Design a protein around this nucleic acid. Structure first.
Ligand SMILES: [Mg+2]
Ligand SMILES: [Mg+2]
Ligand SMILES: [Mg+2]
Ligand SMILES: [Mg+2]
Ligand SMILES: [Mg+2]
Ligand SMILES: [Mg+2]
Ligand SMILES: [Mg+2]
Ligand SMILES: [Mg+2]
Ligand SMILES: [Mg+2]
Ligand SMILES: [Mg+2]
Ligand SMILES: [Mg+2]
Ligand SMILES: [Mg+2]
Ligand SMILES: [Mg+2]
Ligand SMILES: [Mg+2]
Ligand SMILES: [Mg+2]
Ligand SMILES: [Mg+2]
Ligand SMILES: [Mg+2]
Ligand SMILES: [Mg+2]
Ligand SMILES: [Mg+2]
Ligand SMILES: [Mg+2]
Ligand SMILES: [Mg+2]
Ligand SMILES: [Mg+2]
Ligand SMILES: [Mg+2]
Ligand SMILES: [Mg+2]
Ligand SMILES: [Mg+2]
Ligand SMILES: [Mg+2]
Ligand SMILES: [Mg+2]
Ligand SMILES: [Mg+2]
Ligand SMILES: [Mg+2]
Ligand SMILES: [Mg+2]
Ligand SMILES: [Mg+2]
Ligand SMILES: [Mg+2]
Ligand SMILES: [Mg+2]
Ligand SMILES: [Mg+2]
Ligand SMILES: [Mg+2]
Ligand SMILES: [Mg+2]
Ligand SMILES: [Mg+2]
Ligand SMILES: [Mg+2]
Ligand SMILES: [Mg+2]
Ligand SMILES: [Mg+2]
Ligand SMILES: [Mg+2]
Ligand SMILES: [Mg+2]
Ligand SMILES: [Mg+2]
Ligand SMILES: [Mg+2]
Ligand SMILES: [Mg+2]
Ligand SMILES: [Mg+2]
Ligand SMILES: [Mg+2]
Ligand SMILES: [Mg+2]
Ligand SMILES: [Mg+2]
Ligand SMILES: [Mg+2]
Ligand SMILES: [Mg+2]
Ligand SMILES: [Mg+2]
Ligand SMILES: [Mg+2]
Ligand SMILES: [Mg+2]
Ligand SMILES: [Mg+2]
Ligand SMILES: [Mg+2]
Ligand SMILES: [Mg+2]
Ligand SMILES: [Mg+2]
Ligand SMILES: [Mg+2]
Ligand SMILES: [Mg+2]
Ligand SMILES: [Mg+2]
Ligand SMILES: [Mg+2]
Ligand SMILES: [Mg+2]
Ligand SMILES: [Mg+2]
Ligand SMILES: [Mg+2]
Ligand SMILES: [Mg+2]
Ligand SMILES: [Mg+2]
Ligand SMILES: [Mg+2]
Ligand SMILES: [Mg+2]
Ligand SMILES: [Mg+2]
Ligand SMILES: [Mg+2]
Ligand SMILES: [Mg+2]
Ligand SMILES: [Mg+2]
Ligand SMILES: [Mg+2]
Ligand SMILES: [Mg+2]
Ligand SMILES: [Mg+2]
Ligand SMILES: [Mg+2]
Ligand SMILES: [Mg+2]
Ligand SMILES: [Mg+2]
Ligand SMILES: [Mg+2]
Ligand SMILES: [Mg+2]
Ligand SMILES: [Mg+2]
Ligand SMILES: [Mg+2]
Lengths: 204, 122, 118, 137, 59
RNA sequence: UGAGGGAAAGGUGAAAAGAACCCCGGGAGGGGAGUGAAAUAGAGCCUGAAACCGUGGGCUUACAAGCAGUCACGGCCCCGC
RNA sequence: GCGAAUGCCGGCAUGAGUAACGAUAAAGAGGGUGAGAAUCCCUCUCGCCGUAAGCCCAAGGGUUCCUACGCAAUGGUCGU
RNA sequence: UGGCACCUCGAUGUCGGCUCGUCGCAUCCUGGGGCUGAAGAAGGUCCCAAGGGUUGGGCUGUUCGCCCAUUAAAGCGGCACGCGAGCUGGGUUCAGAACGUCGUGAGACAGUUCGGUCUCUAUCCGCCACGGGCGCAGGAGGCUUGAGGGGGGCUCUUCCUAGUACGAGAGGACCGGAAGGGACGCACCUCUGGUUUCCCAGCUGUCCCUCCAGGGGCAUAAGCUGGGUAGCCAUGUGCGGAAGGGAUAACCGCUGAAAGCAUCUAAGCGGGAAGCCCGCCCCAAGAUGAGGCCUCCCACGGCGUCAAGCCGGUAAGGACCCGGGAAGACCACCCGGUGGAUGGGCCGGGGGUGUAAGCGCCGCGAGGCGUUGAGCCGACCGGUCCCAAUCGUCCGAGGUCU
């Protein structure tokens, strides 16, 4: 199960032989590994990567002080990529091949305290025809005496977005070796600058 | 992208001039209708001496929309007005001269006799 | 939801905001130093620095662009004839914003002390 | 340098930047086409281009023409492999760069508001390139 | 009288518990680098006046 | 409008001897000093309860479900040789 | 001889530091008085009414008019 | 539809519709199977199965019901004939008025028609989200397993097999493969189309700056019109449901006695569904059952009811304050704070707008030309320390017991 740390840098169109492909260029550069798990130590046996460089003065040293591999500590979240196993130095893009289906797991855009019509795609009341204040309200939220209480998960307003979102079955278009970039087929979760992990899709 | 209660303009010479479509044949709840899509239309106004009278419930295929057709190479195309061609129940046009331009998706979606009949296919 | 919009909306409308920047430009360029609230100042600096960078040219058209937002000819000739020479050896950022203590009694708002850089 | 037009310049190493610059005037545009299996039959398409929404690599433009009493307009990406894009009559006079007002009035008064230019005609015929220097000596 | 009404009154163990969060915090007071008085950070010492530069007006 | 309806509001001290004067405070308000049997008898001031609002001390509560109580065991604190 | 009468009178609670603070015409800045100024006085800009949000009378109200001294109380905040 | 009259007359808002769902199966379809008066397809009936769907309209206030076009289907019910501290008031259960009938009349009709006040502030439970305190038996920075819980749990058409099997023929499959659709859910703004409030251009009336020119205010809380980048969306784009494993319901079995035969069952072993549990994704150690791993610091610096459980500073760290952020109601999360590109200004690029002001020429003039793809720039991307994060301040273990 191949995977990588990446960051969205924007999206555009590429041109194939006949059809244009809505690619997302994504910067999954050289990722230093810092720690390997073990079945005899923790069991689940994952591998811990970290990707983007940090100057050694903003660190606080429970973090500064990892051993020989990746002495220069990275910035972002040291993600473990779930039974992937590299050789030991770094993970480049050439682990991936063009024509493979890759999963992208990132962090989507939080819309704030988003509404119920924008959040759960309701319909609401009409604008005309006497409607007092129902133009964006959800409406009825239950029943009278039996059952009484409102059920759990009634799909009302709250914090829509800003959660870890996985978009799946993305085919690899092109690989850029000199800057270590990837070109997925659109619809990556996350903004311009949102870190993702890119695994292998199954879909066997 | 034509909907119920839409006045398609007939680009055929079957007598009908302007029709109003109701139900799109795609499945359970066909919301829209692209170009190359069989619809059911009632004939509002017609020219005389034609086999298609007023109030006939006929089938048709949509050949021109004001909303774009998105070609798969990234390119797209729009038209000036909504148009339809009076098809029968066995997917054959009742008229032997279709007016104006049509699209290219009629070819890859089955219809050859319409596209071969259209003078300037876009 | 302003996921990228800068704006600096100030509980007013558009013409009150632009005429407010017109008024604080005249009041800041008349006496130099100024004392106001903090978010009005931290966007007013991006306006007065635009007026001083449109004062570095001095070519009969940027004078008119200064006169689009400064309707006093006596203030514009004082701006060009007394402010424009001594800032020519500085590239950008001709206005310092230093926050002032002793907040207002009736409002409880933090104060801002904004003056021309020496 | 983590983000911007240097990363977006890497996927612009197949750009076709030899085709000429054009204002909103009359032109003709041929294009590759896939139908009935074979990829042959490049197709010409003339008319007045309306909107020039240039944006980085993936620019777009729309050529409208009147076809048999039906206004048919067309959305082109300018960098997909269209072969020749030659301008028939460089009319121009684009006082408005987005001349969407034509789609209301479909009549002879198009060119009285979209008049023929003189400037780009002057540096076009002055830039006609016909200087026989190749194997002249 | 209208649509929201308190059905029962809140006791001391609920009124005196909802007031527990909103309390005044002590304002931070760093010493002035010239003045021997306290002042919040990133603003003007009211007697110092930024190392006596753009200060409360002296003679 | 009007015919008409229609309130609440007593208490310093024996004698104002009603707090000179100093200090903080813009003033108000007091802290001292003094008069006074008493000043929590300070000027709408005798006694001054309860509801109510706090301050200080002992016990107990962040894994327990109750018209909140009663009984039992135990722990902690305070009186009493 | 009170605990009940959607009892009465007087005080104090809950609702709660919650809603509102009264036409979406619009405020900003520099000085002065003052212990204390977004609100008081002066000056420079901006906006609003201008068949009035301007002026003159009769109704009506009864010193609300002016000056000087002050903020016990009032001004839906402060306020000299 | 009833019967009863048991809480409700100091009142528990009545029909219908919109939004929002949830549940049962006695299943409308999709999924299996037995029988058939099942040649094949299409059928009829019955058993299991509620996982997902159950259209867009006309008519009437209608639930219901009747028609148009489709689909595989436009299921029956409950949840105060679900839902008025959500909404609608079309009918009925208000005062006006009229029609037909009854009544001498006043008036009445479970007969008809027009019109007719639908009540800003959430106290507690519930629910959607985000927090503070404390705990997690030394204190912190991270990474992460998953006890458990929800989402999705769809479905049609065309072609090869195959016009073969079957049937005289008309007709026309099971098994399996390939492609494309209808609805719903997630993510994005590159293509298409919107908004983009002062970003640009043009224009009318008035006033003002200074007469001309050129500008500014108002005509909305944009003065109108045409555009409009970033951002936010769908009308756009990319994906999702699975592929596979186990135990299974109906059903089909293998071996086999009771009951020398037979038998799917009494022992066992199987096959067998959109059903269940696995599997995908996020929530998640307040899973006190408080998990696991790596790294940094740690004896006294004084003394009890002794290793703080009597206290003052302090190590790792954290907190206050400021700049900010597709992070955000507040809070919280994340990146920085001179060892800096975190924000503002400027520069360069992208992009919006479209030939700026002025000068010269032509024309009596309105106006047109060259200077000029110039001038103007809100966000997109880098660089620049020019300005602002200057100085700083406060908590923080001192390593209990078998
Ligand atoms: Mg956000
Ligand atoms: Mg709506
Ligand atoms: Mg409304
Ligand atoms: Mg209403
Ligand atoms: Mg219950
Ligand atoms: Mg910004
Ligand atoms: Mg306000
Ligand atoms: Mg570029
Ligand atoms: Mg209390
Ligand atoms: Mg004495
Ligand atoms: Mg006393
Ligand atoms: Mg005394
Ligand atoms: Mg007292
Ligand atoms: Mg008193
Ligand atoms: Mg007495
Ligand atoms: Mg007393
Ligand atoms: Mg206490
Ligand atoms: Mg427990
Ligand atoms: Mg406990
Ligand atoms: Mg008990
Ligand atoms: Mg009593
Ligand atoms: Mg009462
Ligand atoms: Mg009372
Ligand atoms: Mg509050
Ligand atoms: Mg509130
Ligand atoms: Mg409240
Ligand atoms: Mg309020
Ligand atoms: Mg206001
Ligand atoms: Mg002022
Ligand atoms: Mg002042
Ligand atoms: Mg002063
Ligand atoms: Mg003011
Ligand atoms: Mg009088
Ligand atoms: Mg009076
Ligand atoms: Mg008086
Ligand atoms: Mg006075
Ligand atoms: Mg006062
Ligand atoms: Mg007051
Ligand atoms: Mg005074
Ligand atoms: Mg009954
Ligand atoms: Mg009885
Ligand atoms: Mg009651
Ligand atoms: Mg009732
Ligand atoms: Mg009733
Ligand atoms: Mg059944
Ligand atoms: Mg049945
Ligand atoms: Mg079946
Ligand atoms: Mg059959
Ligand atoms: Mg169900
Ligand atoms: Mg269902
Ligand atoms: Mg209702
Ligand atoms: Mg109600
Ligand atoms: Mg209700
Ligand atoms: Mg009604
Ligand atoms: Mg009504
Ligand atoms: Mg009546
Ligand atoms: Mg309100
Ligand atoms: Mg609440
Ligand atoms: Mg918490
Ligand atoms: Mg996790
Ligand atoms: Mg689990
Ligand atoms: Mg639980
Ligand atoms: Mg589950
Ligand atoms: Mg767009
Ligand atoms: Mg946009
Ligand atoms: Mg004006
Ligand atoms: Mg006016
Ligand atoms: Mg306006
Ligand atoms: Mg206005
Ligand atoms: Mg047998
Ligand atoms: Mg069995
Ligand atoms: Mg079995
Ligand atoms: Mg099985
Ligand atoms: Mg910066
Ligand atoms: Mg450019
Ligand atoms: Mg450009
Ligand atoms: Mg330029
Ligand atoms: Mg710029
Ligand atoms: Mg630029
Ligand atoms: Mg702006
Ligand atoms: Mg920028
Ligand atoms: Mg930037
Ligand atoms: Mg640079």
């Amino acid at each position: 199960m191949k995977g990588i740390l990446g960051v969205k840098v924007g999206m555009t169109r590429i041109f194939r032989d006949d059809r244009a492909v809505p690619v997302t260029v994504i910067l999954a550069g050289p990722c230093p590994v810092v720690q390997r798990r073990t079945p005899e130590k923790d069991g689940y046996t994952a591998v811990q990567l970290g990707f983007l460089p940090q100057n050694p003065k903003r660190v606080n040293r429970p973090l500064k002080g990892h051993f020989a591999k990746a002495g220069v500590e990275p910035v972002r979240i040291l993600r473990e990529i779930r039974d992937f196993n590299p050789e030991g130095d770094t993970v480049t893009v050439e682990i991936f091949k063009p024509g493979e289906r890759v999963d992208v797991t990132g962090t989507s855009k939080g819309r704030g305290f988003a509404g119920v019509m924008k959040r759960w795609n309701f319909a609401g009341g009409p604008d005309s025809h006497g409607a007092h204040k129902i133009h964006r309200h959800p409406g009825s939220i239950g029943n009278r005496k039996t059952p009484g209480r409102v059920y759990k998960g009634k799909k009302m307003a709250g914090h829509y977005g800003a959660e870890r979102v996985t978009v799946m079955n993305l085919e690899v278009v092109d690989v850029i070796p000199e800057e270590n970039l990837l070109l997925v087929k659109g619809a990556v979760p996350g903004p311009n600058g949102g870190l993702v992990i890119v695994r292998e899709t199954k879909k066997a | 992208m034509i909907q119920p209660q839409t006045y398609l303009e007939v680009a055929d010479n079957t007598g009908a001039r302007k029709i109003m479509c109701i139900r799109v044949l795609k499945g359970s709840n066909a919301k829209y209708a692209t170009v190359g899509d069989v619809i059911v239309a009632s004939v509002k106004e017609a020219i005389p001496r034609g086999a298609v009278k007023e109030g006939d419930v006929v089938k048709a295929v949509v050949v021109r929309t004001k909303k774009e057709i998105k070609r798969p190479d990234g390119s797209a195309i729009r038209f000036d007005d909504n148009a339809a061609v009076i098809i029968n129940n066995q997917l054959e046009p009742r008229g032997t001269r279709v007016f104006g331009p049509v699209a290219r998706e009629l070819r890859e979606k089955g219809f050859m006799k319409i596209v071969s009949l259209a003078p300037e296919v876009l | 939801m302003r996921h990228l919009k800068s704006g600096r909306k100030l509980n007013r409308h558009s013409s009150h905001r632009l005429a407010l920047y017109r008024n604080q430009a005249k009041s800041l360029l008349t006496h130099g130093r100024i004392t106001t609230t903090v978010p009005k100042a931290k966007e007013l600096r991006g306006f007065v620095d635009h007026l001083i960078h449109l004062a570095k040219r001095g070519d009969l058209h940027a004078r008119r662009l200064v006169l689009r937002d400064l309707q006093d000819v006596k203030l514009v000739r004082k701006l060009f004839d007394e402010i424009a020479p001594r800032y020519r050896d500085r590239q950008g950022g001709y206005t310092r914003v230093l926050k002032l203590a002793e907040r207002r009694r009736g409002d409880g708002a933090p104060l801002a002390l904004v003056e021309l850089v020496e | 340098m983590n983000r911007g037009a240097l990363i977006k310049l890497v996927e612009s190493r197949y750009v076709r930047t030899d085709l000429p610059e054009f204002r909103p005037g009359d032109t003709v545009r041929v294009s590759y086409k896939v139908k009935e299996g074979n990829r042959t039959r490049i197709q010409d398409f003339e008319g007045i281009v309306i909107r020039i929404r240039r944006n980085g690599f993936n620019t777009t433009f729309t050529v409208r023409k009147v076809s048999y009493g039906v206004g048919v307009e067309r959305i082109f990406p300018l960098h997909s492999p269209l072969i020749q894009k030659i301008d028939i009559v460089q009319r121009g006079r684009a006082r408005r760069a987005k001349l969407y007002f034509i789609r209301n009035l479909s009549d002879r008064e198009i060119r009285r508001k979209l008049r023929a230019d003189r400037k780009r005609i002057d540096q076009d015929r002055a830039a006609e390139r016909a200087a026989k220097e190749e194997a002249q000596k | 009288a209208k649509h929201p009404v308190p059905k029962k009154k809140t006791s001391k163990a609920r009124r005196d518990a909802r007031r527990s969060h909103h309390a005044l915090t002590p304002p931070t007071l760093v010493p002035c680098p010239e003045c021997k008085a306290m002042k919040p950070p990133h603003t003007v010492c009211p007697e110092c006046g930024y190392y006596a530069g753009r200060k409360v007006l002296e003679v």
